[PDB]
Write a protein that binds this ligand. Structure first.
Ligand SMILES: CCC(=O)N1CC2(CCN(c3nc(NC4CCN(C)CC4)nc4c(F)c(-c5c(C)ccc6[nH]ncc56)c(Cl)cc34)CC2)C1
Ligand SMILES: Nc1nc2c(ncn2[C@@H]2O[C@H](COP(=O)(O)OP(=O)(O)O)[C@@H](O)[C@H]2O)c(=O)[nH]1
Ligand SMILES: [Mg+2]
Length: 165
């Protein structure tokens, strides 16, 4: 069983906890406690490989540098109806680059809440940013579970592309 250490980063309220809960439990949580920062496991077969995913759901206030230093891949999450959350991505990416001392860190940009009407961040802005960074862009809904598996599996794939597993 190969382990993958994943970290989910991004602003409060973008749906980090809700995505993580969906992947594991196939349940959408309407409110999940914003101060619960924890680590979750999921055994999944991806491309004929039994993976044990170790997902840190970041939370709390602004041991951290430990998961950040050793995490193999990062989900950088904004909400499509939260312009500030999107603007914040630059900071998360910068800081991840710093800790890894690398422009090439396995990462996926996730634009969540795709079910909500009238996005304030359009797919073009999100694609432009992902392209600049050399990373995939995936739109999700934790509410409906759409793109949720795609985000996490694509991250596992970006990790493999970077390093032997
Ligand atoms: C509602 C509760 C919830 O859901 N939360 C998730 C939550 C968001 C706030 N968080 C962070 N915020 C800020 N800074 C600010 C100031 C100005 N900007 C523009 C935006 C935020 N920096 C952060 C940061 F640098 C890192 C980080 C990175 C990337 C890389 C290596 C690292 N080593 N050590 C920290 C760190 C991490 Cl991991 C989080 C925050 C932490 C975790 C709280
Ligand atoms: N419509 C909708 N609401 C969502 C989605 N993801 C999360 N939410 C809601 O947005 C709020 C913040 O979600 P949460 O998962 O706690 O975000 P976090 O602060 O980044 O962990 C919660 O009320 C969720 O129910 C989504 O895809 N769609
Ligand atoms: Mg949370």
């Amino acid at each position: 069983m190969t382990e993958y250490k994943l970290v989910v980063v991004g602003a409060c309220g973008v749906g980090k906890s809700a995505l993580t809960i969906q992947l594991i439990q196939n349940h959408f949580v309407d409110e999940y406690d914003p101060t619960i920062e924890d680590s979750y496991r999921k055994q999944v077969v991806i491309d004929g490989e039994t993976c044990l995913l170790d997902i840190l759901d970041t939370a709390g206030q602004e041991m951290r540098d430990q998961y950040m230093r050793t995490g193999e891949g990062f989900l950088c999450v904004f909400a499509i109806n939260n312009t500030k959350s999107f603007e914040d991505i630059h900071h998360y990416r910068e800081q991840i680059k710093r800790v890894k001392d690398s422009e090439d860190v396995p990462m996926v940009l996730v634009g969540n809440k795709s079910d909500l009407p009238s996005r304030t961040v359009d797919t073009k802005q999100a694609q432009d940013l992902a392209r600049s960074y050399g990373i995939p862009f995936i739109e999700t809904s934790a509410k409906t579970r759409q793109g949720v598996d795609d985000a996490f599996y694509t991250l596992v794939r970006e990790i493999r592309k970077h390093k032997e597993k």
